[PDB]
Amino acid sequence: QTDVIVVGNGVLGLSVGVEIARTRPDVRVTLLGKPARQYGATPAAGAMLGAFGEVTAHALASEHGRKKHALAVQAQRLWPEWIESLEATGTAADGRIKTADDTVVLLNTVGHSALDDANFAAVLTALKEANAPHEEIAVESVDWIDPDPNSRPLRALHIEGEGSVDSGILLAALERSFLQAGGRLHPVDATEIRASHGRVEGVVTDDGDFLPAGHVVVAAGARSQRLVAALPGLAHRIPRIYDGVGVSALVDTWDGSGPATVLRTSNRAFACGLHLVPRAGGSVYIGATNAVCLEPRGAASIEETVALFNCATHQLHRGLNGSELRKVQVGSRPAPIDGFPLIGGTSVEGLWMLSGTYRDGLHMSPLLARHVVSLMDGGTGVDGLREFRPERDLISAWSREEILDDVVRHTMATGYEFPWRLPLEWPHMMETFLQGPFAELADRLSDTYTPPADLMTAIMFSEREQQDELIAYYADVHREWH
Amino acid sequence: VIVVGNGVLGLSVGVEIARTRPDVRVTLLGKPARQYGATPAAGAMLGAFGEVTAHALASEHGRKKHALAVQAQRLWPEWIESLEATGTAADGRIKTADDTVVLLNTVGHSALDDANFAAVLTALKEANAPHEEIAVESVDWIDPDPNSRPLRALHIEGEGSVDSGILLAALERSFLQAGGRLHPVDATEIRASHGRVEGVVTDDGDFLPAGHVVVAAGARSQRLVAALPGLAHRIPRIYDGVGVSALVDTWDGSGPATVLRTSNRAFACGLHLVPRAGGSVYIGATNAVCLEPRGAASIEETVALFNCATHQLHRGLNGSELRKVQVGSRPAPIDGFPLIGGTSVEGLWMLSGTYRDGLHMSPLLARHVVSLMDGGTGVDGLREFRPERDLISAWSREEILDDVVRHTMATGYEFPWRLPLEWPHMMETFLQGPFAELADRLSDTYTPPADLMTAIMFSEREQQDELIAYYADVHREWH
Amino acid sequence: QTDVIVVGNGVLGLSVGVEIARTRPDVRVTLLGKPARQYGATPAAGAMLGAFGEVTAHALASEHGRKKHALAVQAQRLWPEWIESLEATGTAADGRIKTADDTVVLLNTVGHSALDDANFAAVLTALKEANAPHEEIAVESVDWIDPDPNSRPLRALHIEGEGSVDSGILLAALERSFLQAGGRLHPVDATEIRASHGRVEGVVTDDGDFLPAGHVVVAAGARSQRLVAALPGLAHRIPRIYDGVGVSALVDTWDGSGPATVLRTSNRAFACGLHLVPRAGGSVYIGATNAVCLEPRGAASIEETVALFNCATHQLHRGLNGSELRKVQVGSRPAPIDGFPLIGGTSVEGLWMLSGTYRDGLHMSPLLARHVVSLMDGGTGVDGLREFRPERDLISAWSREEILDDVVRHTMATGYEFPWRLPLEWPHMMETFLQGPFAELADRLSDTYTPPADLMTAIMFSEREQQDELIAYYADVHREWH
Amino acid sequence: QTDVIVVGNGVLGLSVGVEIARTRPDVRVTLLGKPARQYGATPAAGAMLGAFGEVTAHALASEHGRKKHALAVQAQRLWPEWIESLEATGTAADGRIKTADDTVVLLNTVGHSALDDANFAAVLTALKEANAPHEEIAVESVDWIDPDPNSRPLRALHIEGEGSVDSGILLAALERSFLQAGGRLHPVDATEIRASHGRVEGVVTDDGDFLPAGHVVVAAGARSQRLVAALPGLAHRIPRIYDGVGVSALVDTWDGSGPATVLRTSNRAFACGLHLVPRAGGSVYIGATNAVCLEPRGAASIEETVALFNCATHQLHRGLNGSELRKVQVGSRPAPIDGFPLIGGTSVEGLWMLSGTYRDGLHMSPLLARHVVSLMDGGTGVDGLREFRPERDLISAWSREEILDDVVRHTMATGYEFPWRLPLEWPHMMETFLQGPFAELADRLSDTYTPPADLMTAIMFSEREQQDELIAYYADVHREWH
Ligand SMILES: Cc1cc2nc3c(=O)[nH]c(=O)nc-3n(C[C@H](O)[C@H](O)[C@H](O)COP(=O)(O)OP(=O)(O)OC[C@H]3O[C@@H](n4cnc5c(N)ncnc54)[C@H](O)[C@@H]3O)c2cc1C
Ligand SMILES: Cc1cc2nc3c(=O)[nH]c(=O)nc-3n(C[C@H](O)[C@H](O)[C@H](O)COP(=O)(O)OP(=O)(O)OC[C@H]3O[C@@H](n4cnc5c(N)ncnc54)[C@H](O)[C@@H]3O)c2cc1C
Taken in order A51, A52, A57, A63, the sign of the CA dihedral is positive
Dihedrals phi, psi of B323, to nearest 5 degrees:
-95, -35
**Burial, D1: exposed, middle or buried (Cβ in 10 Å; 0-12, 13-18, 19+)?**
exposed
Same domain? For A267 and A290 the reply is: yes
Q: Which residues of A touch C424 (CB under 8 A)?
A: 148, 313-314, 318, 321
Q: Name the residue with the closest Cα to ligand 2, atom 49.
A: D37
C-alpha closest to that of C451 among C390, C396, C388, C414? C396
Quote the distance between the C-alpha of residue A185 and its chain's center. 24
Quote the distance between the C-alpha of residue C395 and its chain's center. 18
Partners of C275 in the β-ladder:
C264, C287
Q: What angle do CA A453, A458, A463 make, to 5 degrees?
A: 145
Same domain? For D136 and D253 the reply is: yes
User: Helix B423-442 and helix B397-413: axis angle, to 10°?
Assistant: 140
DSSP helix/strand/coil, A27: coil
Partners of B324 in the β-ladder:
B247
The C-alpha atoms of residue A380 and residue A149 are separated, in whole angstroms, by: 52
Is B69 among the domain residues? no
Å from D327 to nearest chain C CA?
A: 10
**Burial, B179: exposed, middle or buried (Cβ in 10 Å; 0-12, 13-18, 19+)?**
middle
Is C404 among the domain residues? yes
Q: Which residues of C touch A112 (CB under 8 A)?
A: 149
Å from C424 to nearest chain A CA?
A: 6
Taken in order B58, B59, B65, B67, the sign of the CA dihedral is positive
Is C215 among the domain residues? no
Same domain? For D272 and D136 the reply is: yes
How far is residue D207 from each of residues D124, D191, D201, measured CA to CA in Å?
Answer: 52, 9, 18
How far is residue C53 from each of residues C122, C123, D365, measured CA to CA in Å?
Answer: 10, 7, 57
Which of B213, B359, B361 has most ligand 1 atoms within 8 Å of CB, for mutation?
Answer: B359
B207 close to B250: Cβ distance less than 8 angstroms: no
Cα D309 to ligand 2 centre (Å): 22
D466 close to D437: Cβ distance less than 8 angstroms: no
DSSP helix/strand/coil, A344: strand
Is D294 among the domain residues? yes
The C-alpha atoms of residue B91 and residue B165 are separated, in whole angstroms, by: 11
Quote the distance between the C-alpha of residue A48 and its chain's center. 11
DSSP helix/strand/coil, A148: coil
Cα B160 to ligand 1 centre (Å): 19
The C-alpha atoms of residue D415 and residue A423 are separated, in whole angstroms, by: 7
Own/partner pairs, B422-427, CB within 8 angstroms, 24+ separation: B422/C303, B422/D321, B422/D322, B423/C414, B423/C415, B423/C420, B427/C430, B427/C433
The C-alpha atoms of residue D367 and residue D370 are separated, in whole angstroms, by: 5
Q: Domain end: D332, D361, D376, which one?
A: D332
Partners of A334 in the β-ladder:
A243
The pairing of beta strand C190-196 with beta strand C199-205: antiparallel
Same domain? For D159 and D248 the reply is: yes
Same domain? For C319 and C419 the reply is: no
Own/partner pairs, A201-205, CB within 8 angstroms, 24+ separation: A202/A1, A202/A3, A202/A5, A203/A5, A203/A7, A203/A32, A205/A32
Mutate which of B281, B299, B300 to disrupt the A interface (most A C-beta within 10 Å)? B299
The C-alpha atoms of residue D116 and residue D113 are separated, in whole angstroms, by: 5
Taken in order C60, C63, C67, C70, the sign of the CA dihedral is positive
User: Helix C453-460 and helix C464-481: axis angle, to 10°?
Assistant: 140
Is C12 among the domain residues? no
Residue D209, C-beta contacts closer than 8 angstroms, at least 6 positions apart: D188
Q: Is D362 in the pocket of ligand 2 (CB under 6 A)?
A: yes
B435 close to B406: Cβ distance less than 8 angstroms: no
Same domain? For A158 and A250 the reply is: yes
D298 close to D329: Cβ distance less than 8 angstroms: no
Torsion, Cα D251 D256 D257 D262, to 10 degrees, reads 30
DSSP helix/strand/coil, D309: helix
D31 close to D183: Cβ distance less than 8 angstroms: yes
Same domain? For B128 and B175 the reply is: no
Residue of C nearest to A118 (CA): C140
A422/D436 CB distance under 8 A = no
C-alpha closest to that of B83 among B374, B371, B362? B362
How far is residue B42 from each of residues B82, B298, D113, measured CA to CA in Å?
Answer: 21, 18, 33
Same domain? For C153 and C249 the reply is: yes
Query: What string of H, E and C letters represents the secondary structure of C383-420?
Result: CCCHHHCCCCCCCCCCCHHHHHHHHHHHHHHHHHCCCC
Question: A59 preceded by cis ω (within 30°)?
Answer: no
Q: What's the number of domains chain C is made of?
A: 2
The pairing of beta strand D275-278 with beta strand D283-287: antiparallel
Is A17 among the domain residues? yes
Dihedrals phi, psi of A4, to nearest 5 degrees:
-120, 130
Rg (CA), chain D: 22
Same domain? For C285 and C417 the reply is: no
Resolution in A: 2.1
Residue A137, C-beta contacts closer than 8 angstroms, at least 6 positions apart: A104, A156, A157, A158
User: Helix A400-416 and helix A453-460: axis angle, to 10°?
Assistant: 70
Pick C113's closest partner by Cβ from A152, A155, A419: A152
User: Helix C426-445 and helix C464-481: axis angle, to 10°?
Assistant: 50
Residue D3, C-beta contacts closer than 8 angstroms, at least 6 positions apart: D27, D28, D29, D30, D202, D211, D212, D213, D214, D215
The C-alpha atoms of residue C206 and residue C226 are separated, in whole angstroms, by: 15
Taken in order A267, A272, A276, A281, the sign of the CA dihedral is positive
Q: Is D44 in the pocket of ligand 2 (CB under 6 A)?
A: yes
The C-alpha atoms of residue C389 and residue C382 are separated, in whole angstroms, by: 12
Determine which helix (DSSP H) or strand (DSSP E) holds C100, and give its type and residue range. strand C98-100
A250 close to A285: Cβ distance less than 8 angstroms: yes
Partners of B155 in the β-ladder:
B101, B132
End-to-end CA distance of chain C: 36
B296/A252 CB distance under 8 A = yes
Amino acid at C237: R
Quote the distance between the C-alpha of residue D118 and its chain's center. 22
B436 close to B404: Cβ distance less than 8 angstroms: no
Same domain? For B344 and B232 the reply is: yes
Q: Domain end: C289, C310, C333, which one?
A: C333
How far is residue A144 from each of residues C78, D219, D436, measured CA to CA in Å?
Answer: 48, 71, 50
A55 close to A123: Cβ distance less than 8 angstroms: yes
Dihedrals phi, psi of A356, to nearest 5 degrees:
70, 30
Q: What angle do CA B75, B78, B79 make, to 5 degrees?
A: 70
Same domain? For C408 and C320 the reply is: no
The C-alpha atoms of residue A471 and residue A450 are separated, in whole angstroms, by: 11
The C-alpha atoms of residue D11 and residue D17 are separated, in whole angstroms, by: 10
**Burial, D282: exposed, middle or buried (Cβ in 10 Å; 0-12, 13-18, 19+)?**
middle
**Burial, A132: exposed, middle or buried (Cβ in 10 Å; 0-12, 13-18, 19+)?**
middle
**Burial, A281: exposed, middle or buried (Cβ in 10 Å; 0-12, 13-18, 19+)?**
exposed
How far is residue D49 from each of residues D73, D76, D101, measured CA to CA in Å?
Answer: 10, 7, 9
Strand order in the sheet with C342-345: C184-186, C29-32, C4-7, C215-218, C351-355, C342-345
Q: For the beta carbon of residue A104, count every other beta carbon within 10 angstroms.
A: 26
Q: Domain end: D313, D332, D351, which one?
A: D332
- Domain span at B340: 2-40+165-238+335-385
Q: What angle do CA D428, D439, A412 make, to 5 degrees?
A: 40
Q: Known binder of ligand: residue D42?
A: yes
The C-alpha atoms of residue D271 and residue D242 are separated, in whole angstroms, by: 14
Q: What is the largest CA-CA distance in chain B?
A: 69
Ligand nearest to the CA of B167: 1
Mutate which of B106, B149, B262 to disrupt the D interface (most D C-beta within 10 Å)? B106
Pick C150's closest partner by Cβ from A154, A322, A416: A416
Determine which helix (DSSP H) or strand (DSSP E) holds C335, and give its type and residue range. strand C324-336
What length does chain A have?
482
Q: Which residues of D touch A420 (CB under 8 A)?
A: 420-423, 426
The C-alpha atoms of residue C292 and residue C332 are separated, in whole angstroms, by: 9
Is C86 among the domain residues? no
The pairing of beta strand D103-107 with beta strand D262-264: parallel
Dihedrals phi, psi of D371, to nearest 5 degrees:
-55, -55
How far is residue C114 from each of residues A315, A321, A463, B315, C151, measured CA to CA in Å?
Answer: 17, 22, 51, 38, 18
What CATH number does the domain containing A33 carry?
3.50.50.60
Dihedrals phi, psi of C335, to nearest 5 degrees:
-100, 100
Is B86 among the domain residues? no
Same domain? For C439 and C328 the reply is: no
Residue of C nearest to A117 (CA): C154
What CATH number does the domain containing A161 carry?
3.30.9.10
C-alpha closest to that of D277 among D300, D304, D249? D249
